[PDB]
Design a protein around this ligand. Structure first.
Ligand SMILES: [Cl-]
Ligand code: NA
Length: 460
């Protein structure tokens, strides 16, 4: 009742019983603490009681045990937290029963159930959660840096828009005003003529909200946060107000996104998680990698090709995701350009900042899939004089310049192409399936949306 915290204590058999009983009795006798249950998590070397009902009677608490003393009983911990609606799991164990890795596995279980996980010198808080959305919703998050989370979220937004779900995006980003701003990405025209104006102001604004709306081409609520935690919380954010704005917009469906590791602290129906095949394995299979993957209804694996990842790296990542989240759908992908408009039969100058080692693959993909002739590649998208010099080589050999759609591309690359009198076709960098034995990415995204709408209708 009141503010008496329901605590579950983790204890081991590498302690003599009186020391364990002493600590449990102290916590049970202390104000504001209710020890609802004890989970014995392993060890037998110091046990002097063989009968577990005796152990429980002498301790004076319900005591839960896994069958194997050599391993952490992760499912017994999860079930105990749910049974007693525990507020805190207090770890009173030590080596050799726990180590760093096992404590992050325990933390991932406890924090997912909305309980604090604490020990002598560490405390982890579960994610802040505001239940504010009055529309069906998904959250799209990532497991690390440089995995193309932005390209995956904007692709998802465009797919959901294309299938007539009338989405909006709430983007909790790295800048913006204190009151969330509405950016009408639905009104943006992907033409050189329209963009010339609006990209310069986007570049110079103290936010990426314009670029978010440019990539998604949907109604965007521009939010901000300062930093992100290890689990994915943030110190301070206006995203709760951004969600309340989304409820009032002409939209039927809400996509919540966050910058970096920061997970929007707004309850959604379903989640998409992006994982990079290029990540250090430890960031996937250790720390809070498994926690994030455990949130997924759909995992998109990115960068599934050399030089970012070997076949062996890609299969280990797929294997790990199936072991921790077997119910999630999983799609492995690579990034490829998708032109916005027709390039079939056209001679193309491909304006791309992609590494030399992958340009060949992208060129072969454009020629084989979209039927263009790539006559040249220029990496000079940010420098006007160098792009001008490049255009001098190609201004008589190319029908158009094919350029990635980013705020930076409009202000520089578009202007110099239109100045040189060369047609401009934009392209999006999109996730493409590499392994037909996994599903269709668009169908996987729409399945999540349908599940979200069903959840929303059934909960009312
Ligand atoms: Cl277990
Ligand atoms: Na107490």
């Amino acid at each position: 009742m009141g503010e008496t915290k329901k605590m579950i204590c983790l204890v081991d058999g590498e302690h003599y019983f009186p020391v364990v009983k002493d600590s449990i009795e102290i916590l049970d006798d202390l104000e504001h603490i209710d020890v609802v249950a004890v989970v014995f998590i392993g060890g037998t070397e110091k046990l002097q009681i063989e009968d577990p009902k005796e152990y429980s009677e002498k301790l004076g608490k319900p005591v839960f045990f896994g069958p194997d003393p050599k391993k952490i009983p992760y499912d017994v911990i999860k079930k105990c937290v749910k049974k007693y609606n525990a507020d805190i799991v207090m770890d009173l164990s030590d080596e050799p029963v726990v180590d760093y890795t096992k404590r992050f596995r325990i933390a991932s279980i406890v924090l997912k159930e909305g309980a604090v996980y604490q020990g002598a010198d560490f405390k982890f808080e579960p994610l802040t959660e505001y239940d504010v959305l009055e529309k069906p919703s998904i959250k799209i998050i990532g497991t690390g840096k440089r995995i193309g989370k932005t390209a995956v979220s904007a692709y998802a937004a465009r797919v959901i828009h294309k299938h007539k779900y009338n989405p909006c995006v709430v983007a909790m980003g790295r800048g913006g005003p204190r009151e969330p701003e509405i950016v009408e990405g639905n009104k943006i025209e992907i033409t050189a003529e329209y963009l010339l104006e609006q990209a310069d102001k986007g570049v110079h604004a103290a936010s990426d909200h314009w670029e978010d709306a440019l990539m998604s081409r949907i109604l965007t609520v521009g939010c901000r946060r300062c930093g992100g935690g290890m689990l994915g919380d943030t110190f301070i954010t206006n995203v709760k107000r951004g969600a309340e704005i989304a409820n009032k917009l002409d939209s039927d469906f809400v996509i919540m996104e966050g910058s970096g590791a920061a997970i929007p602290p707004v309850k959604t129906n379903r989640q998409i998680v992006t994982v990079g095949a290029n990540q250090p394995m430890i960031n996937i299979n250790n720390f809070f990698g498994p926690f994030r993957i455990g949130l997924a209804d759909l995992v998109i694996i990115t960068m599934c090709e050399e030089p970012m990842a070997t076949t062996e790296k890609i299969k280990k990542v797929e294997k790990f995701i199936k072991e921790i989240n077997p119910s999630a759908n999983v799609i492995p992908t690579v990034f490829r350009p998708k032109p916005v408009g027709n390039v079939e039969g056209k001679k193309v100058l491909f304006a791309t900042t992609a590494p030399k080692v992958v340009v060949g693959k992208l060129v072969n993909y454009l020629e084989s899939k979209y039927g263009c002739d790539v006559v040249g590649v220029t990496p000079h998208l940010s420098n006007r004089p160098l792009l001008r010099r490049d255009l001098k080589k190609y201004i008589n050999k190319a029908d158009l310049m094919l350029t990635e759609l980013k705020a930076a591309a409009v202000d520089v690359a578009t202007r110099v192409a239109i100045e040189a009198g060369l047609d401009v076709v934009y392209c999006d960098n999109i996730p493409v399936v590499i392994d037909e034995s996994y599903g269709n990415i668009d169908d996987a995204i729409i399945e999540v949306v349908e599940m979200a709408i069903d959840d929303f209708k059934n909960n009312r």
